[PDB]
Subunit: 369 residues, 4 copies
């Protein structure tokens, strides 16, 4: 039991610009605002709560090491890397291609530290120095496919980490479990043809991106059957999420027998998130983390690495993230002060449409060898 | 003919404090934040868009007139009025009662101007000077019952306005249609025994408060049948809302034949709102407004007054509000720049559970004489 | 009689980006920040106080009308106008030339409204519809010379107004009195050879720009003697400023007999300004305004137009501006709540070095015909 | 190429709730509109901390955890009555002002005030007794305006006096110096040690900037403490030349005469060229030279024992570079330019003006009475 924790100051310095989502735009009458939806303060407040709560005293700080060009090229194209260097070199940075993904001047340095934080924690868990950990990285990763930045993501951090373990550590099988509320299309893309990385995405159906995350997207060639999408309807809460964990996610992991589990740990499924419509509470994320850590203990010697994805409530995300940290440390010392306010809103009964969405995926488990 | 518009600078000066929802609290480790969820910038950004878009050139600006004690006592108890001016007269103000509802020293001035904005616009529409209008007030109203402040609401603005229309203008029947995503419990309470003010609330079921808004809440005594709740499931979008408008709301208004329609116009049912889980877009709000305004044209010579309630997306609320203003002016000159991004997310299909929730209410129409 | 007042919502929407002064830059480790020093909220808070104080009920609101190409060319070169059109048309705008003055895409719209606010107010004062007024414009103007943007100024608003007054309003003489704390180098340049616009600048010596504002800069050719710089030492307060008004500025205006006085009204000489080291309080600005308005009454039928320049204290600038507005309206209804706090800090004694700096300018007065 | 340099930051220093006003509270009747960042908002000091980390300076520092100041610690500098009153405000559901109408605190805010004073104490404990050579305690809230019996001017407890008190009573040092270069007069520190020659208190400040009624050169202490308080009031517009002249002519000679066993620096950066709360012209290079001179003095006279403790400073833009310059002088690692250097160097302040010279000359005769 030693739990690694990655925070780098520059994770809080990501420049999301002066827009809300896209850039500010006078002709469209999109007024500038101080905090873009993805502003780094949300994740910084999570870090600061980790410290102020005293959880930091039970964690082993791990320094990020910047990802090299060669590290990035394991997961991404040369053109993509060149384009990110171009944008980062501009005097005020700029949009990276999709119109909602700003990088500041010099912001490539932070993207390298974000991917490198995930890699470094993976490395140190795999040696046995650490039993597990949480890499509280920013910018996020899971939307970025081989040849682009997308959806606030510059490089696919979890895929860079999985690529490292496969290339360097002699790991035959790795699983990436993504519970960010948005479809992990980038991760799905990168490993589409590859059975050596089982990619699972639990998400709100068609939330982002628009035309993806269907359960019929199962990979190709040798990789067919090694991508599992679990699209859930808007309004799904703890009961639906936990049913999905018990009926689909955990059985998939046990069938596949990964040697390492990487969690794309977003908190944008929270009850208070502006960028999705789900009803998960901190206690829901707690139970999700507890189940996944316990699964890792059973099947891969406890080797589990959490890597921050999205989440957009500066108010509530810190308590969602703290719950996961407490499940790693085993020190449960602070309440969720929003518990009683949120518990009365619902989401804790499994609805028939939620049950049916999960049942659609159960047959795909038979094809995991 | 002429459309009134109320904005007062002090609506943007409401001091929501340094907490997120409740106050910042060091022992709970709730870190202070610049913008409380209910910070006035959200509604100020709506006002600024009304101006910057050119909509202000098609509106007649109407100054708020502070609500008198006489005005406030038509909706509220003598003890409540005394208690707010007791609280406002305290050296730094204080707690109105529920732990999420601030008032500053002299913050009664803003509460009076908010209610008075609704009254003054009502007076000018109901007397025939204006055809209709929008009062972009703050603080909001609909959670304040006869004897208390609640859920960010000091006085029940729409009920103060309805009370004025009844007692001063001699209207025999008024309807208040509340499409803020939270249950209008305050409005329901005030008029509970009174068939002369038909109160309708469309809302996310049990979102806030956690214990009201059931469709069994129908009024009492002579008021029985003149309160209609339409609780909707989380995830409901444009399709559910428009189905509710056509199957329940418009028929209720036609059966009742109000001489004035007041709309409690919240935008917290929007797709990007943190404080509910609904999926309405600016186009949904546009169609809701168009339907209600056309109903008013048919049954009460177009006498319709919109009064701002909640809504918590500083990014997207301005476009939701602008769409409603455009339906009043008839000048549709600015695209919603979020439309394509949000359209893909859904909410645009009437789901069986949404339809069933609305169908439960249809039999209640028979009792509206 | 009537006092005109210009505010346009877009003046508050100028996007100053994510840096402090220059852009954020990660190599330099200049961390992004929400409010650039020149963020438009400072001027917006002045506008909001004009309204909240009740001064707006004593003012005649005057809509800004976009400055035309012909208007701009009375102060600037064809090349500069075309370059601003070029930068504003770029997909995400850009650098206007100096590395720090930026325009967003379509930002030319705001620059035209800023200059056009000054023009429209000037027209309506000159015709006698209004006796005087205040144009609370943004972006500012006085650093922009004939052939460039500079120091966050796109067009020289007061020179566009002066040029309009000369060519369209028939005025043979105009004076521009600039009491922004920084040297009005742009205004000086534009009218350098022209005795028909007397240009006066009171400023902190070498504050910005670093190499101009010496009292030896007196114009050339027919314009020799018709530019007057009054550089003052850091730490100069109410005593120095009022002595400079009494000994130099008012005598210059009286000797010149302008038909209109345009004031470049900055408040960055205030006691709490980050971007200069001067000690002027709201009462100092009040007295400067009272004196200049009274001078206008004596020499040009009261024709005086105030046009906003700089000022960077969001806390205190609103009260400095309000004091000027109160001298225009004659309604003195709110105290400066900082009065006692700032009065104790000094600046209210004429120091020998301050007296000496002002006495250096006196011989230049003899040459004004 | 350096010995161990202690550094104190605690997350809660960044969580001090300064409210919704500018200076005093927001006030509707006065028409003081609410604002996100109060002048004294903790982000300014947090931006300094984050630059220490992002610049790589943190790799050359020894992080030292704050230890909460105990009642006994606070009572070496303050009255029992003052300690008791800070508890009450700290219990209020949203906190409140503590006395003077500009000194906001929270429910629980005493926790942070104890951690601020305790950061100064803990660094002092480790520097004295030789574990560390020197250090910087980047604390918040600040200290120097709080006198024996009150909170004042954003200060709850007098952090540097709590540290000096510990050094005197617990470590048994006979002589301590507190050098305060925050731009405002250190009236609280002056008050606490007024009668006491065992703590030499020096304050460089803008004359009558804050408070409005103190900091004259005739305030020299009383009784056995007569001659062991030295004020150097300077005129508005004073810059690097004035401050370095003051260091060379008054401050450093005073320290050499007094022979303190420990030098505590009340390290504010509100004398900077871009500060809203004073009218001085010091640049980061100025603060660099001031720090270099003071550390070298400590090396000469008290075995290098020097503890910097954060006081004021209100430019979130520029303060981090001023603070970083001081940190670089402690580590000897000079890896980042001041990006404002050229912009500010043209503004002046680097020539000694006659009135500046005169203000400093007035104080030189007081050096004769330091025994
Ligand atoms: O955490 C995340 C980020 C998700 C996400 C990112 C960006 C989104 N984009 N929105 C817009 C809005 C308006 C116009 C164009 C695009 C939508 C979702 N996913 O994991
Ligand atoms: O627009 C609205 C918003 C209603 C609303 C009402 C109550 C809320 N309070 N939440 C909390 C959270 C934590 C602790 C106590 C209370 C938050 C939002 N009504 O229309
Ligand atoms: O009110 C004003 C302020 C003008 C002003 C002009 C230029 C400025 N440039 N500042 C920098 C700062 C850092 C690096 C380069 C340049 C900063 C302020 N003019 O009237
Ligand atoms: O760093 C500092 C700043 C001190 C400071 C002290 C007192 C201050 N008082 N401000 C006001 C302003 C308005 C009304 C009452 C009081 C403002 C600043 N001291 O070291
Ligand atoms: K795969
Ligand atoms: K996912
Ligand atoms: K009723
Ligand atoms: K409702
Ligand atoms: K001239
Ligand atoms: K000037
Ligand atoms: K002493
Ligand atoms: K001092
Ligand atoms: Zn996401
Ligand atoms: Zn609501
Ligand atoms: Zn200026
Ligand atoms: Zn200070």
């Amino acid at each position: 039991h030693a739990i690694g924790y990655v925070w780098n100051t520059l994770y809080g310095w990501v420049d999301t610009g002066t827009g809300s989502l896209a850039a500010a735009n006078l002709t469209a009458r999109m007024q500038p605002i101080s905090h873009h939806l993805a502003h780094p303060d949300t994740k910084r407040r999570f870090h600061e709560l980790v410290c102020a709560s005293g959880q930091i005293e039970h964690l082993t700080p791990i320094a990020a090491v910047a990802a090299t060009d060669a590290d990035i090229l394991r997961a991404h194209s040369a053109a993509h890397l060149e384009n990110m260097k171009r944008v980062s070199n501009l005097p005020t940075g700029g949009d990276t291609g999709d119109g909602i993904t700003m990088m500041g001047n010099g912001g490539l340095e932070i993207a390298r530290l974000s991917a490198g934080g995930a890699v470094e924690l993976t490395r140190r868990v795999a040696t046995g120095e650490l039993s597990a950990g949480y890499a509280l990285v920013n910018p996020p990763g899971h939307h970025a496919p081989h040849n682009a930045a997308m959806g606030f993501c510059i490089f696919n951090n979890t895929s860079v980490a999985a690529g490292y373990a496969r290339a360097v550590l002699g790991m035959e099988r790795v699983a990436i479990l993504d519970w960010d509320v948005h479809h992990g299309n980038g991760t799905q893309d990168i490993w589409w043809n590859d059975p050596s990385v089982l990619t699972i995405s639990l998400h709100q159906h068609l939330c982002f991106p628009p035309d993806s995350g269907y359960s019929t997207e199962r990979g190709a060639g040798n990789g067919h059957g090694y991508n599992i999408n679990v699209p859930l309807p808007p309004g799904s809460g703890n009961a639906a999420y936990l049913h999905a964990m018990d009926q689909v996610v955990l059985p998939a992991l046990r069938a596949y027998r990964p040697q390492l589990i990487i969690v794309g740990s977003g908190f944008d499924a929270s009850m208070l998130d502006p960028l999705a419509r789900m009803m998960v509470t901190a206690d829901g994320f707690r139970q999700m983390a507890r189940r996944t850590i316990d699964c890792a203990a059973d099947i891969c010697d406890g080797r589990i690495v959490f890597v921050q994805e999205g989440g957009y409530s500066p108010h509530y995300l810190p308590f969602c993230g703290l719950a996961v940290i407490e499940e790693l440390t085993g020190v449960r010392s602070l309440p969720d002060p929003y518990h009683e306010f949120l518990a009365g809103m619902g989401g804790n009964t499994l609805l028939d449409a939620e049950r049916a969405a999960i049942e659609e995926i159960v047959p795909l488990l038979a094809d995991i060898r």
